[model samples]
Target: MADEATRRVVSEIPVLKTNAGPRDRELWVQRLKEEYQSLIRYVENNKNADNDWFRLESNKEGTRWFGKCWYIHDLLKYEFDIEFDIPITYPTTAPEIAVPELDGKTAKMYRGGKICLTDHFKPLWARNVPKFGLAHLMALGLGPWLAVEIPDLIQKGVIQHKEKCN
Candidate 1:
């Protein structure tokens, strides 16, 4: 379904000229293109959906990254939103996702978001997660992670906020 322009861009990922051999560079180019194309599809899917929040956007730094996809007044929606700050570092190192609403706290790691995929279990759990690639991990895990974790925390926060308001 990817168009010619997309395919071209995907094929042309720049190589690390000095360090990479021809094959190494070719592989890198292929991987980057795949990731980029997947991200584009993800953005399109999430753009008009109401049930989820992970949206891809180009950052102010001009790097393509994923963010909590919501509007300014979404705060009023009582929907819990979290931002994925960086690409998952090989899924082995975990990622740097933060819930800005939680005052600079992590979502899945911290209590207020969802899911507790702990850091203690390395290689056995996180390693060799080829299915756990960078572009789709959040999307892949959203059903279990965001659905259970974020809503409850947001409910608690909302209740606390309401109590204070009263």
Candidate 2:
């Protein structure tokens, strides 16, 4: 879907062996712990590469997640707040990540900024199951969306980069 140093770092983020989603309250805590750890390393993976940036936290139950994804484009920062909820059917039923800022310009989105993943990605997510979690969620779906769409939108002048919005 997109390209660059993202793949190497994400593969190092590890996978979730736990099958429990947010609903299984007690077990969800364990799953969420690894979820946070995976991204913690992902965010911490800035050892050499100066690329890739994202941050996240969850609601008390760890069902709802919200955060920011900032990518440097043309030496400027393009930041967007992303949000999503882990459905009870997670793992097998991966959640949808949203970038509400570009809802108007995106045809790959649903009513409330939930980006509609393509049929191609849908299958990929389904096949991954418990092995994939928040890390792959962005790596697989959101990263490519930003890689492809965000730059295009900036060029189209729909979403302003640091040059504007000043």
Candidate 3:
């Protein structure tokens, strides 16, 4: 059973359905609440700042999420659309983040538009377990991906200021 704080946060978000056992679900729910709180804090602090450029939204079922993060490269601002989902294994498996707009534009991507979390990302996430969540994934995974790949793509003329259609 989730504590009062965990239940409150989870209640505000969309419903979550996991195939993991009961114990795993309880622990994951608590960790998710913590992660959500951190994400809220980050947004509150940065949303109106001069460097403002981060947004996140979840599907009605809460099984999947979508987000956008912007970065400045060479004085040009670039935005990346990111998505991820909680695996059936919950805390045991880290969610895979992806940038759909950059799909097929870079070799660092994999099938299903998944960003290849290489270098220390895979190991660090695997070891962190419940300690890491969406905020960490965004700051550690998507942030670095854009910082590195966006510049390369711009230089290669593959991603020279394009916007997604509504």
Candidate 4:
């Protein structure tokens, strides 16, 4: 059971706005749930995975979790051959996906390494919210969504910036 402090911290996290489209909402909810479960399984399977530069301990205000170094490592090695220190922090907080080692190819929407994601604070593997008795905000929310959107923004920005420079 969560103590009073934990409850308060959990409450401070924002509730995701349900989508107007029922179908979309259902799909989003389902996908999020699946991702959560996958995360849980990943964490459990590698609970003792040694922390690398990318996966560091998170020291956020309300909540925190060990950073997902394994995932980042896998993603980077496959995608860019770049390895970085994982910036794991509270779940409500996004991990610092950027490692300078990769020529700044971090998955971030903003200039700084800020992930844009939110979470309802459940174990990365739970289904029901209330019944599951899991509430811990991790690096999951708008930040990640925005991060995903950044690539297009970067391309556009590059073009615009080049036009001005010329």
State which candidate has the highest lDDT: 2
Top candidate when judged by TM-score against the true structure = 2
Model 1 C-alpha lDDT per residue in residues 1-166, reported as the tens digit of each score: 3245333323322221122111344654554555556666555555555543445454543223445533222244333455554332433343445445554233455564434554432342253343333344544344345455546665566422222211
Candidates 1 and 3 compared: the better one by TM-score is 3
Question: What is the TM-score (0 to 1) of candidate 4?
Answer: 0.24
* Candidate ordering by TM-score (highest first): 2, 3, 1, 4
For each candidate in turn, give its C-alpha RMSD to the true structure in angstroms. 10.2, 3.3, 8.5, 16.2
Q: Which digits, one per residue and each the tens of the lDDT, describe model 3 over residues 1-166?
A: 3245334333332332233412455655655566667678656645655545678887644568888878776566767777888777655566788788888988999966888866777776666555556666665677667777878888898765534322
lDDT for predicted candidate 1 compared with the true structure: 0.42
TM-score, candidate number 3: 0.73
| Displacement of the residue 75 alpha carbon in candidate 4, Å | 9.5
Candidate 1: lDDT of 68? Answer: 58
Which 10 consecutive residues of model 3 have the lowest summed lDDT? 13-22
Q: What is the lDDT of residue 139 in candidate 2?
A: 75
Model 4, residue 14: what's the lDDT? 32
Instruction: Give the Å error, residue 148, model 1.
Output: 1.9
lDDT of 4 by residue, 101-159 (tens): 22334344345444423343333313423222111223233223334443444445421
